[PDB]
Design a protein around this ligand. Structure first.
Ligand code: CA
Ligand code: CA
Ligand code: CA
Ligand code: CA
Ligand code: CA
Ligand code: CA
Ligand code: ZN
Ligand code: ZN
Ligand code: ZN
Ligand code: ZN
Ligand code: ZN
Ligand code: ZN
Lengths: 412, 400, 390
């Protein structure tokens, strides 16, 4: 059982669930139908469990990439807008919501890293990456630095690498290319080279993590950081005089950061397929639907053009969206996890001297590719161990030289 | 014994081997050549060991699907009939015996599932699936259900899943796009959904199997069942007045049942290749040859067009042919082993509430691909270890 | 080590590093840039350890076959000899030094198996495989056999199996289609059928390894052997009147040896990529350059035309080049190892009578396309669980 004649929605408790419920109210008052919004724990964990017995929420709200696996398990119902409607959203957000060519979620809001500079010690920010070292001569010479951001994690380093032509997978004709990794090429190489050069030239540090990186900007210690929206509130506290903007060009190229997208999926097991659509198209994805949620907890930049323009009047929001256009969507496939991991150790070793640029990046391509094949066999092993006859664990691994065979046979 | 100079044939007990032994006789007149016929045991299991070391029969009769295995391993000789012999048989039986384009065996009998119904409870078969819920009440109102058959096995339940777009792997060119599985499409989805309803609406029981369903039908308890021509003999015995017909359409579409073709192949090792060809092409696949084998043990439909027409005079045989002319030829590849269990699972989850249709069905495809490539890599690794110690124990140790 | 404004070269201990060293002495004269030839142990093992931290020599000498792996690990630089200079080397050698479009090395020398025959027993060697049974029972009449060579290793047997149509992987674009394995076809089937026929008519023995074969020939027991230029020095010592010639044809088709190439590669981490190529293009890959190296030890046949034509005045060397020209350049890809032992097993079972040609030949294909991706999963385990954690 799910509902029937009523809507039950799921959204992460950290979001504007209060503001959303009031749209469910405007909706009960317009159609006479009850909207119950819920905020459970590990819902992104619980969902695939219950949705799979035919249960859970009618609608679900989450970052888009987690949906790849949902839509894969066949958990999301394919959605049905007219062309006239899709024209109301920045068209690239539509890219964030398709799988084997099928649209599977409504895209709510948009996340991306931007460039954050302390307006006090840097009134004008660098328009390109290549200025930053030479500018360090200035700032290091008043006992300050020019830039500091997390180096322990690829998500942060990736906008530079990708800039010159680097890329995860070839998204092309509404479809990803799982052989075409693009992390070995010309652009990724020069990208990671620059990044390592700075850590050799001593413009940066390789044990720079999150705690370490964030602090320094918050204490007017470095002029710039790279980070996304989720970070604002803490700079706000610090009292540090700040601004937010486009990412500096590298080799005349825009930096290409990874875009995450809040999305609204419809449970494939929902009786109320028609109502939910109705709620999302006609009530939520409206200026007052979004302005509503946004009031409870701000959304970053929004998907709806109309409301983006009204919201864009924040220089900080303006940047977030501008960068998010200049960026690449983040893939919702299985393969993505392996990539992350391989590129982590790529940059760890390259920046630690451990390995050269040209070699480590090539390793990530081949080292991360050998895992995608390994990950599906691991799922094949547990399915042949399952039955083969929400706790819940979980023998797990490891494998090696195990079986097994099959059964017997019928006949007569 | 590498055969040599004479013809030895393998084949199975459940077949008319004496009627074939009689074809070995007639042949022996005009060439003088002696055809022995052995009906050994698990000769789908002996043949790959005997013919590993150049031995076994010159020829083997078995179902086509097993031959892709033989054929793959390199065990069967590519055969060469001309244009003119080829048109003696339903061209569709030909794609049943191609491996990577090469014709590789001889087509004999054709096997498909059929609609089997009690003319006494029900005078008239439904051309349609949609109307089965309706029929059930008419019948259950007189202490009788409309339709019962094995729900546990995917091979029985496949035809409705297949009906509207479903397929194991895609065929395009005498070859099988193994990356083109289609149990996730809407067709499969629709068909599975429909069956699942029939179960939840108590028009059917999920614990229904071959035993129960064959029995219920044979005790005049359910107006209909789905079975193949193997079970015809029990229904005669039941003294139930049965008839057999084409399977019901779904969404206007014919049911798509898995086809099996009885097939004869030539040991890639056989010294007697020219011999065997003349025997089958000129003595067996003649109206009289099949007759003999059939008069011994019946064959169901046969690929030989002209004796096939004489057999359609039995209405039951006529519909086995109709059911199969519309069916999905059963694949002979490795990823078929895989595909069965994945579907066996999905269908059972879907029938039990365990999972939803879209889900249960959006797994097998992923599980089969992973289960197949798992099967192909683990047993090659096992064959690597097997012949590694078989070449070191008696060969490397032999020196002791 | 690691380098910086001077050159350092590695090349295996058993080669003309002295000639090579004395080219350094010439180069250093017109430049003032010191070259250093070192030949450390297991250098094909160590180089990928140290090229991987931005270290090792500036330039590396080893057979093209191991360079696949280096380039694939991003370890060597791309090389850009202009079109005029590629023209100086035999065109087909350039194929041995290309990896996914990229030119990754300079060919030097060429190696391949050849027919070595005893002149005293065999004034004139056969052009044909098929007449060897004739030849053998002509010879068994004087207690001598026609041919003995290494049957336990595919490298030696392949040239026959390949002769009528076999191939490892398909090549037709500086790229090796690895789903296209050609060990399952008519050519190779028959090519194996014949070899196996020889063995079961006693016209040849099943257990013939390398030594048995070297001995048999080196003590004039057998008229012919198949071997490469490495065997030569011992048939000098064995004092046998001997000839190195073209391999016999089969079903009218050139026998197809596997071709190996000594190649010179630049560390992608090398700070002197310019000099490196100036050295190689203007000092080493010149008559005098090779002449010198070739003097310390013979290179065999050489990838450079002009000086190749000088060495081809020696019939043995010329026959190496012609066999080389009719053979299969060796795949440098990873699926090549997987190729090897599978064909090693195919033969050993077909030749043992344990399996038919067709069964064994098809079984190798299952192993070739399975052990190749199993090695990819091997790297997915070790080089991940180790450096990953932990
Ligand atoms: Ca609840
Ligand atoms: Ca087994
Ligand atoms: Ca069955
Ligand atoms: Ca017998
Ligand atoms: Ca008749
Ligand atoms: Ca040194
Ligand atoms: Zn909560
Ligand atoms: Zn600097
Ligand atoms: Zn307003
Ligand atoms: Zn009903
Ligand atoms: Zn040494
Ligand atoms: Zn003979």
């Amino acid at each position: 059982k799910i509902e029937e004649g009523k809507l039950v929605i799921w959204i992460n408790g950290d979001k504007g669930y209060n503001g959303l419920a009031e749209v469910g109210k405007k909706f009960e008052k317009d159609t006479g139908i009850k909207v119950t919004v819920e905020h459970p724990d590990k819902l992104e964990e619980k969902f695939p469990q219950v949705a799979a017995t035919g249960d859970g929420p009618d609608i679900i709200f989450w970052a888009h990439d987690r949906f790849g696996g949902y839509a894969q398990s066949g958990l999301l119902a394919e959605i049905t807008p007219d062309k006239a409607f899709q024209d109301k959203l920045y068209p690239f957000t539509w890219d964030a919501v398709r799988y084997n060519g099928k649209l599977i979620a409504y895209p709510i809001a948009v996340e991306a890293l931007s460039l954050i500079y302390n307006k006090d010690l840097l009134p004008n920010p660098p328009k390109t990456w290549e200025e930053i070292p030479a500018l360090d001569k200035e700032l290091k010479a008043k006992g300050k630095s020019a830039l500091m951001f997390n180096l322990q994690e690829p998500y942060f380093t990736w906008p530079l690498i990708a800039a010159d032509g680097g890329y995860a997978f070839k998204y092309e004709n509404g479809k990803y290319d799982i052989k075409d990794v693009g992390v070995d090429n010309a652009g990724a190489k020069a990208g990671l080279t620059f990044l390592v050069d700075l850590i050799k030239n001593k413009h940066m540090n390789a044990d720079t993590d999150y705690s370490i990186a964030e602090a320094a900007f918050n204490k007017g210690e470095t002029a710039m950081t790279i980070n996304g929206p989720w970070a604002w509130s803490n700079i706000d506290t610090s009292k540090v005089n700040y601004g937010v903007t486009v990412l500096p060009t590298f080799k005349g190229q825009p930096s290409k950061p990874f875009v995450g997208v809040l999305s609204a999926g419809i449970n494939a097991a929902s009786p109320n397929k028609e109502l939910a659509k109705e709620f999302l198209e006609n009530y939520l994805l409206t200026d007052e639907g979004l302005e509503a949620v946004n009031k409870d907890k701000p959304l970053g930049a929004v998907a709806l053009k109309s409301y983006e323009e009204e919201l864009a009047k924040d220089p900080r929001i303006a940047a977030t969206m501008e960068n998010a256009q200049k960026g690449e969507i983040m893939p919702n496939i299985p393969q993505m996890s392996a990539f992350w991991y391989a590129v982590r150790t790529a940059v760890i070793n390259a920046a630690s001297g451990r390995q050269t640029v040209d070699a480590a990046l090539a390793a990530a391509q081949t080292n991360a590719a050998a895992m995608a094949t390994l990950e599906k066999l691991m799922k094949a092993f547990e399915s042949l161990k399952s039955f083969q006859q929400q706790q819940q664990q979980q023998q797990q691994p490891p494998p090696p030289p195990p079986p097994p065979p099959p059964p017997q046979l019928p006949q007569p």
